[model samples]
Each structure stands twice: as C-alpha cells, then as structure tokens.
Target: MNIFEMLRIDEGLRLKIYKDTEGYYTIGIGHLLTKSPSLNAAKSELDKAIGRNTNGVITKDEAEKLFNQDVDAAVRGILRNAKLKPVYDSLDAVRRAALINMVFQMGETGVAGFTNSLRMLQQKRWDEAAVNLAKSRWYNQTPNRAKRVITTVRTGTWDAYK
Candidate 1:
C-alpha cells in the first residue's frame, strides 16, 4: 500500500508504513498537521483532553468509527475540487499539492477568498504568490508548515511539493 493507504487516511484502519526525513518508518502516523486526530479511549479521556462533555467511555471500534474520515474530507475535497482550475493552471503537481494541502488546511476561503493572493495567482505572480502564501492566518497558526511549503515552492521542488 502507498503512504495514504497505510495510514488508512480514507478507508479504515490499515497498517501505517512510511519513512520520514530521519529514515524512520512508522504505523498510522504522519506529520502534525495531517496526523490522525486523538482517538479517545473513553468518554473520560475525551472530556479530560478537551475539558468538556460526558460520554464516559467508548470501545476501540466505536472510536475508530467516529473519526479520521469525517474531518479529513474538508481538507481533501476542497483541494481536489474541479472548480479550482485557475489555481492549478501553472502550478506543478508538487506546488499544486502543497497549495492544495494549504488550502485543505486553511480552507478555500483563505486561499481564493481574498484579493492580493488570489489576484496574484490569477495573474501568475509566482514570487508574489509565494509571498501571498506567507501572508495568512494559516501562516500565523502554522509557521513551520508555511515555511516548508514556501520553501518547497521557491526551491523548484514542485514535484516534491505536491
């Protein structure tokens, strides 16, 4: 299975297998932004973690059924949407993927929802496009993520960026 498959990112729980920069392979795990959300062992665990509610406890099977796919679709669908052709016009797969990933994380409202950034992309301002990426709430919430994506774009690893 590929990286997405091993992580069971879409389907169900499958073996997680992939290597990171440190050359370490893992199971059902990835980077922070895309990693699986917390699967609470019980209602108590959920309450303690989030500091509210009272379901008490749920079985492993139940918790597994409750998460992952539900939340990830917003990220995946917005990126893969057919209506976003303009953004993909000149972007290579990597840069496209990174932008999609960013969009998935930041939501379409943040990416195509404004002027300078959206206008820059519409005008094909590559440098301004990259800078536009740095100028968002996403950058504030995820500094390292912004840096990594912008770096990939500026460095010509568009294939890798995807």
Candidate 2:
C-alpha cells in the first residue's frame, strides 16, 4: 500500500472530536487540533473544510482532505530536515513510507531526534536502525505501531502490514 493508505490504517478514521492516546483534542484522521494556532482557528478551519459548522462531526470527504494535507505536510517536513533528507532520499518506497509514517505521528523535529537511528538508516544498517527505533520511548508508548514501523525499517518491505 501507499503511504497515505498505510497512514489511514495506522491512524484510523474518527469523524468526531476525541482524545488521542496522548490526551490531545484530535479529530478527522489524527488531526491534532491542539497543535493548531488556536483551538478556535482550528475549529474555524474545520468548518471551512467541511463547508459548514460540523459541531462535533465531519464528513468522510472532509476528513480525507485533512488527511491528505497532513500527509503532504509530513512528507515536506521530512525532506526539509537537513539530517533526514539524505536518509529519506536513500530509502526505497516502503522504507520511505515507514519514515513518513513516523513523521506523521511524531512530527519532523521529533523524528529528527532519532540521531543514531537516522545514522543507522543512512548507512543502510537496517537491523541496527530498527533496534534503535525499538529503544525509543515512542516504542514504549505505542508498541504495536512501533513494532510494525520498525519491522518495515528492518525488512525494507510492506510485509509488516500484511
């Protein structure tokens, strides 16, 4: 599957406002409203995206739009990082998707903190990279997702999803 499809599965679709695992006010496929400029601005943008005041629920189409924008932002953020760009460029499609998946969840700066893991990835040391990722608090907080992403990094394939 593509990065977007993979992320859709990983993030899961939610039309209504809800608390994420981290207790953030998120909505519509991992859109963290808490991260927006302001909660009111976020809500206004959501209303604009859906073409109406949704109250607490949004349409699937609106959610899809938000997901696409978030994925694009994640991709750009990954590429914009000097430390990550080369590593991301050197990866194959599946492995690249794995990186994007990571950025989607943790943000670019957060993933950039994985210095040793990025170095291992850059050197094409797949197992070592996976091991480094597995050592993170992210792995502790979201074990299953971390395991899947780490496996993708180790194997450089989409088999983790299968």
Candidate 3:
C-alpha cells in the first residue's frame, strides 16, 4: 500500500478537532492544526479546506483531501532536507514509507535528529537502523506504531502492517 494508506491506519482518522497525545490540536489522520500560525488561522484553514462552516467537524471526503495534502507536505519536507533527501532516495518503497511515516508524525526536523539511524538506513543496515529507532523518544511516546515502523525498516517490507 501507499504512504497515505499506511498513515491512515497508523495515525487513525479524526473528523473533529481533538487533542493528540502531546495535547496538540489535531484532526484528519494526525494533521497537527495547532502548528498553524494561530488556532484562529487553523480553524479558518480547516473550514476553507472542507469548503463550508464545519464547526470543527469535517466529512470523510474532506478528511481524505486534508490527509493527501498533509502527506504531500511531509514528502516535500523530507525531500527538502539536504541530509534526509539522499538517505530517502536510497530506500525502497516499503522502507521509504517507513521513513515518511516517522516524518509525518515527528516532522522532518524531528526525524532528522536521528542521525545514526539515518546513517544506518543509508547504508542499508536494517537491523542497526531499527535498533537505533527503537531507542528514540519517539519510540517511547508511541510504542506500538514505533515498533511497526521499526519492524518495517528492519525487514524492508510491509509485512509489519499485515
């Protein structure tokens, strides 16, 4: 499956604004609306995206649209990072999705901080990469999702999802 599909399952769908584990205002498959310039701007953008006065609720179609945009943004963010781009390019589809999944949850900067893990990924050292990933605060914050993504990295397959 594609990155979007993988993310939808892992992140879970939310049509209404809610506080995430870190208490960020989030919606639509983990879109962190709180990261917007302001909560007013976030609500405005959400309403505009769904093309209505949503009153903090969105339809499934609107959620899908926002999810696509968020995934695209994560992809672009990864590509734009000098250090991450090359490592990202070197991975196969499954492993690549694993990387994007991490970036989607943590942002490009947060994933970029995994210097040793990135190096291991770049070198195709799957076990080492997975080990490094499991040791991170990200792993501690969301153990199950982190484990699945780490397993994907280790196995270089989508079997983790299955």
Candidate 4:
C-alpha cells in the first residue's frame, strides 16, 4: 500500500462536512481549519476536481476525496492521550462519543487536563464523571451543551446538544 493509505487509516474517514462531537464546522475526517482550507481554496480544488464552483458548498465527491486523505485524524487524535486511551477505548458508543465530544470542543490536551475526572471515568464512576463534567469551566462556557453531554455520559443515551 502507498504511504498515505498505510498511514491514514487511524483517523477513520468522512464523506461530508459534519459538525464534529463539538459544533465546529468540519470536514474530511475532522479537519476543522487546517486541512479543510478556505472557501477560495475549496473552490479552486473543487473546480479542478469536479469542474464546479464550491460557492461555499463542496460536493460529496470532493469531500469524500478530501477526507480520504486522513483516516480519522480527529478521532484518532483524541485517542492519542496515552493515559486515557485504554479507558476511552473501553467505553460504549454513547460514552465514547461523550468523551470525543469533549475532545472536539476542548482538544485532547485540554480534555486530558481533567486528570482526576478522567480517572473517575477510567474507574467507571459515571456519576462522579458526570458531576465533574458539569462542574467544569467548560460547562460554564455553554450550560445547555454541557448539560446535554453530562446527561449522555450519565445515562448512556445519545442526548443531542440543544
């Protein structure tokens, strides 16, 4: 396999600009601003690839190709916190997603700062983890979002951020 294919798998992949676990505008396997590029760049690339002006909307084909470059960089990037990898890997989709949500919003390093809370999560202390999350400064940044995420983590339900 080529180096790109061999190396880009961990990032997973995407076929469209989907808001990540956070609410940031993202595309191409979690490229927020780096790989996603600017409107003019996207337009140029799109024009070259598919002969269409992006006009602020990229085609699925273009998005597919772009995301293919990275496997799941955002998701895999989140898993790079060594101390949290095992615990993060063991979680169910809802809980895992909740953690990824935190990573996307605050970045893995930022998420990693919650050492005690992460330990609580690692210990499967759902209540404590939820409480910890709710009490964070991040929660103060967006109470509704934090509430929804805490609810999801506590209940293992896919509570949509509202």
lDDT of 2 by residue, 56-162 (tens): 68888888888989999999998889987999999998899999999999999999988999999989998888888898889999999889999988998888798
Per-candidate alpha-carbon RMSD to the true structure: 9.4, 2.3, 2.2, 8.2
Worst 10 residues of 2 by lDDT: 34-43
Error of 1 at 125 (Å): 2.3
Question: Taking the tens digit of each residue's C-alpha lDDT, what string does model 3 give over 39-143?
Answer: 677687677767888778887888888888888998999999998899989999888999899999999999898889899999998888788888878889889
Model 2 local distance difference test score: 0.86
> How many Å off is the CA of 142 in candidate 4?
1.6
* lDDT by candidate, in order shown: 0.48, 0.86, 0.86, 0.62
Error of 4 at 130 (Å): 0.9
Q: Give each model a TM-score.
A: 0.48, 0.90, 0.90, 0.58
Q: How much is 122 displaced in model 2, in angstroms?
A: 0.3
Clash list (residue pairs), candidate 4:
11-71, 11-72, 11-73, 12-71, 12-72
Superposed Cα deviation of residue 51, candidate 1 (Å): 23
